[PDB]
């Protein structure tokens with residue numbers, strides 16, 4: 001099958017963040033015996049994995065940067081990188097960071113400049129500057145575009161060239177519904193039928209060269225298209241997660257912490273009620289819904305910064321202690337210490 | 345101020361639960377050099393507190409049980425109970441429970457029979473069988489009635505005898521909204537003016553003889569009445585919490601566990617965001633609202649029992665770990681262990 005990668009990515013913000021490495025990229029370099037994979041990033045890593053682990057035959061990358069200032073940094077041997085990532089990546093990440101930052105001081109931002117350590121040509125990818133050319137006959141279009149208002153402008157060029165029923169994906173840079181609405185603008189066209197498109201995500205939830213994982217939004221694509229993507233993603237990325245589009249943000253953005261805490265709570269609370277009190281799941285859910293909705297309404301009513309002045313965190317200490325059994329016993333003692341520090 | 349306690353309570357369910365003791369009652373009994381307080385329960389404990397610690401000299405208790413089988417168990421000395429609660433209450437609670445269970449086997453339920461260990465008369469309360477008599481001229485009416493359809497029937501018998509502006513409270517046996525709707529039925533009465541009533545809660549969120557705490561619902565009483573009840577409650581019960589009526593249930597009922605976990609989550613998340621990313625509280629709130637609303641809607645959508653088939657608990661491990669800093673570091677490691685156990 002034909003995969004069109006639209007957007008190669010730039011390394012500058014990964015380096016500037018100060019906290020990323022190539023753990024995943026190094027990992028798959030070893031898996032396939034190809035050291036140059038070790039220093040791929042972004043969409044080039046994910047393309048390497050789909051070609052070399054999932055068996056996707058043809059891969060094109062389209063980016064205007066190729067014909068502009070596409071810089072490959074050849075300072076670091078692939079093998080020294082692969083090496084340091086066995087023991088400790090922080091032996092080598094600082095200098096890589098340092099070098100990228102110096103080059104990024106003067107280099108224009110994408111699509112005028114981009115920083116890479118392995119050229120996608122060395123990986124056996126077709127490279128192109130024409131989006132429209134890249135998407136003709138693609139079954140799987142992986143978009144990786146800048147955040148904000150340029151995406152509709154970028155997409156509207158090649159949307160008519162998109163093969164009917166193709167899988168079309170986005171990453172961290174746009175929410176699914178906003179990505180969908182761009183295709184939805186054109187629903188009614190009989191010649192290519194964009195209503196037949198399977199719109200979803202291939203969102204890494206982290207820089208792809210660092211963590212082997214992908215997140216696949218459900219709600220727009222057909223079930224078949226989701227299963228296929230999930231299968232490819234499981235083989236390519238190692239860990240795949242399919243989930244409602246409406247939960248992609250809550251799961252992947254800064255609020256992931258709150259979504260984790262709350263979901264752990266719900267599951268633990270549910271199990272304590274069904275296993276220990278022996279009530280039906282519905283009784284748990286009816287209690288949980290009122291509890292979730294009301295704490296949420298409080299926050300909205302008074303402001304997240306003013307909740308304590310309205311609900312003393314200590315209020316929960318002398319009531320929740322009697323729910324400290326079953327699966328809730330795993331989390332409640334940690335919650336009591338927190339509530340304890342914050343009580344009036 | 346005249347306090348009218350309506351309903352003395354029965355010990356049977358406290359004993360039968362196997363997990364209550366007299367720690368609070370013993371503590372006040374010691375505070376005031378009055379051993380008989382040690383084995384009070386329910387409303388008698390709270391009226392003893394109000395009188396001995398909060399200066400409420402005038403206390404009437406009304407309950408039809410007084411003319412029925414009001415049964416006082418004299419098998420246990422107060423001084424031994426007080427003794428046992430200093431180090432370990434379980435050295436005396438089992439025999440107390442055994443005796444209560446025995447007597448309860450045959451004794452009819454309230455208001456036909458009730459089990460106490462100290463008669464409210466021994467604490468210098470007026471005792472009566474006439475609710476109408478008790479509420480006449482009362483400033484604070486504390487109701488303590490059976491769960492369900494009888495409360496309206498009980499209330500309508502004396503609602504016209506209620507001093508305008510009086511503070512009227514309920515505890516665990518009825519939601520604030522339903523309590524308030526009873527009085528709302530009589531709105532527009534020219535002489536009794538029930539619209540002036542200050543309706544709220546005096547809810548111990550536990551059996552009051554065990555725990556020194558009270559939860560006071562806001563939304564239906566004046567600011568002044570809440571303030572007054574709060575000050576009285578703090579003196580009498582030791583800990584007082586005033587909160588929106590809409591949170592009474594989430595805080596005090598079986599979902600208290602989930603409200604605790606979520607609230608701790610929201611607070612930790614907020615701090616990790618504001619103290620370590622430097623963003624306004626509104627930026628954290630926006631994120632928090634989407635996350636809470638969407639996890640809640642997934643639960644309602646697929647069922648609490650089927651959440652894991654739609655969102656792999658493991659999905660959160662590869663994203664939320666980026667947020668494991670600041671206050672969220674206090675709770676996240678525990679949450680990671682739980683989600684790890686539960687992943688697909």
Ligand SMILES: C=Nc1ccc2ccccc2c1
Pocket residue numbers: 172205206207252253254663666
């Ligand atoms: C494209 N940048 C990123 C980098 C790290 C991330 C970590 C969690 C979620 C989105 C992210 C986006």
Ligand SMILES: C=Nc1ccc2ccccc2c1
Pocket residue numbers: 319322516549550551596597598
């Ligand atoms: C009247 N019974 C109870 C006893 C314990 C409780 C604990 C928490 C909430 C309500 C409760 C009601």
